[PDB]
Ligand binder design. Structure first.
Ligand SMILES: NC(=O)c1ccc[n+]([C@@H]2O[C@H](COP(=O)([O-])OP(=O)(O)OC[C@H]3O[C@@H](n4cnc5c(N)ncnc54)[C@H](OP(=O)(O)O)[C@@H]3O)[C@@H](O)[C@H]2O)c1
Ligand SMILES: NC(=O)c1ccc[n+]([C@@H]2O[C@H](COP(=O)([O-])OP(=O)(O)OC[C@H]3O[C@@H](n4cnc5c(N)ncnc54)[C@H](OP(=O)(O)O)[C@@H]3O)[C@@H](O)[C@H]2O)c1
Lengths: 431, 431
């Protein structure tokens, strides 16, 4: 709206804020990519000073001796407020502190919630009641997990989207590599180019693979409460499926592209277990290092955990551009390669031919997302109906897994996954 | 037409016949890919016996002790006739010998002319006058060089196509690797698939590269009388250009596809020197082996030879599907890699994106060509009008090179070629 912005890191004492948020905002400030009149205000329960945050986080800054002066400037633009997350007086203190800044009463306010969603219901309330700007815009950045299933995610999203408009909500997702946004971009451009030929007449099968060669790196405790379907598939792989199967948008507006994405999502039926192959990785005896340890050998993983580290799922877009064309989402950890690609196999009319869009592996994709929040571009942020459709697609399966607890097929650290995945792929027609 | 075939190797005493024709026909016979009643009759001036040809050529057969009996069968189906190439009595002796074979009077006759084209005018005459079958078909296989320019090639082709119909002429080309026919096949299938999007609206530039890492291997004497444009470009690279830029054929008939190829060729104007970059490779001082020797260090190359071992040429198809779209044919020997690929760059409407068809590097492509001659498929054999159009496109440039003798830019053994080639590519718009 104007020239003055306030970046409010809710929960600045956190681990995400220490290791990623503060270093990323510092890199954006140093490279001159933030607005010139930007203030950063941390807010949390820990009674901290800006010097405490500096000591905690500057090790992660890439702080070189040549950059001292603008680093001191950046930290001069920092302040911190201690307060509770459901205390109205604390939020009033925060609002007064923000108003006391230079043109803080007219400044745009970017709240970013480096907090567990368990407190979101409180925070989003108090903000909406005490800290929104009357003149500049107000944009909120929420973090994963966007709920756990259709029900919890609807509860959280209906609460948040009862206090803020959709163009104020930014559901950020940025944990799958520094090339994510660019991968989605090349897939959208490929959809624009190859659109006229991506039909059920030419295409016989599409895959989307997300491959990782390392395991949970002794962090399986956090991964255990989510699973590989929640971690990679119902958010990222499904979103590139949308980008592949979508119709041409009405324009280049972010909301038109997201409209076409949700229009695709509303054509996918609810996946069932007979189209799913789950898998868990075991230690490799002949390997060395972390390859000798399996998933259950992780000390943070509870004994008897049946959560999958590998998933192969078959979906179907049910319109008359794609009908009976199987979309095979295959992803997993502790595999043979670090690969992310989409490949479309054609109908042989003459072996079978494929078109392969390989994806990686300047603004590092996470810096690009913060910059997009600053600019107002919502294209790489999932919409409420988009998220609801994803959860609707994947919720009955997840409920069945949580209820019946089936053992997912074992596969060795460094393999390609269980052979049953290949059997399913070839049963739905893959060659 | 029936079950009996006679394979007449004109000039069986030759080097091509010893090193390639006889071993290939033996491999086709051993694998059971020839017709069951097939005879092989060599014909040449050297007064030889079948045992002489056996001793000469079996070293190249991959003759294993397990294959002795069918090898003896194959050689039992061989005979040889000594005669002159313009002696009517010798051709009458050959015709009588062929008639004396089992059902030779009704057999199909496949004449394949392992001779320098300098004698073709004689041979093709006498055959047409003395050795054609009255019942079975008669098919002729002619070898490179199909002339030298528009004039010599028209003379030779008008002579040959005054005695045989087009479906009896097979201009074979098979010296660029064992994957040629399959490369052309995948390019045709890519034309069928990506047709609707290969326009001047989406495409901004096409390249076609033929790259070789080794030099003339001390055989520059033969290469010197032709050049890299005659060796690779006016035959193979131009033909895949045709396969890329062509319209959809009326059917899958070989003649419809060749019709579309010649329809494309008749839209390319005559290339001029300001769109051409020629180059010659020199020895690499820091390398080892044949990389230390250049082109002129080849003892078979005449001193002062200005023939190019590298060429970068820009062509334009001039219809309204492609208009102003530059087709950049880039090829050369003694480079950094063994690559053959086509790549099409799209118009950036958002860096620039490309669609890459990489080409290699069962029936080895040369065996496939002999089998196609046996079957009557002429699709991988250039037609008379196709060859005339290629020569018309490239003849004024070749005449200018032969007349003015410009020095082609020097490039080091193992490089990518002269930088002037990149300058030209980027001047016509390549990024
Ligand atoms: N792969 C992923 O999906 C992934 C990875 C990393 C982070 N995240 C998300 O990013 C956000 C930031 O996570 P984080 O690693 O920074 O979390 P964190 O370690 O929990 O701490 C962030 C701050 O939240 C406050 N806090 C934590 N638990 C609380 C509780 N139960 N009640 C009240 N306040 C509490 C603390 O501040 P005070 O004690 O000073 O109040 C803490 O410093 C979370 O929403 C997390 O889900 C997701
Ligand atoms: N890269 C290429 O383009 C390439 C490579 C290899 C071959 N070729 C073509 O393949 C064909 C076969 O070549 P090749 O290597 O086998 O040739 P070759 O070494 O010349 O011999 C083939 C036979 O032709 C006869 N002959 C040769 N020169 C003659 C002449 N001046 N007058 C009359 N008869 C003559 C000889 O048989 P007799 O003495 O018993 O009569 C000789 O054994 C040629 O047309 C050649 O151009 C092309």
């Amino acid at each position: 709206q104007s020239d003055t912005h306030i970046f409010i890191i809710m929960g600045a004492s956190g681990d995400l804020a220490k290791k990623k948020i503060y270093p990323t905002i510092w890199w954006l400030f140093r490279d001159g990519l933030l607005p010139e009149n930007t203030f950063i205000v941390g807010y949390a329960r820990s009674r901290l000073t800006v010097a405490d945050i500096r000591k905690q986080s500057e090790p992660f800054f890439k702080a070189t001796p040549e950059e001292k002066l603008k680093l001191e400037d950046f930290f001069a633009r920092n302040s911190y407020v201690a307060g509770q997350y459901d205390d109205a007086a604390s939020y009033q203190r925060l609002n007064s502190h923000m108003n006391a800044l230079h043109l803080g009463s007219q400044a745009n306010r970017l709240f970013y919630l480096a907090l567990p969603p368990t407190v979101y219901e409180a925070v989003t309330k108090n903000i909406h009641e005490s800290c929104m700007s009357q003149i500049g815009w107000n944009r909120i950045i929420v973090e994963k997990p966007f709920g756990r299933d259709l029900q919890s995610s609807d509860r959280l999203s209906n609460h948040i989207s009862s206090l803020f408009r959709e163009d104020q909500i930014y559901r950020i997702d940025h944990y799958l590599g520094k090339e994510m946004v660019q991968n989605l971009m090349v897939l959208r451009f490929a959809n624009r180019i190859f659109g006229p030929i991506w039909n059920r007449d030419n295409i016989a099968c599409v895959i989307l693979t997300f491959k990782e060669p390392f395991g949970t790196e002794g962090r399986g405790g956090y991964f255990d409460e989510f699973g590989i379907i929640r971690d990679v598939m119902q958010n990222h792989l499904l979103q590139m499926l949308c980008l592949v199967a979508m119709e041409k948008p009405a324009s280049t507006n972010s909301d038109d592209v997201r409209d076409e994405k949700v229009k695709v999502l509303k054509c996918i039926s609810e996946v069932q277990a007979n189209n799913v192959v789950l898998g868990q990785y075991v230690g490799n005896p002949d390997g060395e290092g972390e390859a000798t340890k399996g998933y259950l050998d992780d000390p943070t993983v509870p004994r008897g955990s049946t959560t999958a580290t590998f998933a192969a799922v078959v979906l179907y877009v049910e319109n008359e551009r794609w009908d009976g064309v199987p979309f095979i989402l295959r992803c997993g950890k502790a595999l043979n390669e670090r690969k992310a690609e989409v490949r479309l196999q054609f109908h042989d009319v003459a072996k079978r031919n494929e078109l392969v869009i390989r994806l990686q592996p300047l603004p590092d994709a996470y810096e690009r997302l913060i910059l997009d929040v600053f600019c107002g571009s919502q294209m790489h942020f999932v919409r409420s109906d988009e998220l609801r459709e994803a959860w609707r697609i994947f919720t009955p399966l997840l409920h069945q897994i949580e209820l019946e607890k089936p053992k997912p097929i074992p596969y060795i650290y460094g393999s390609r996954g269980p052979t049953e995945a290949d059997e399913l792929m070839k049963r739905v027609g893959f060659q």
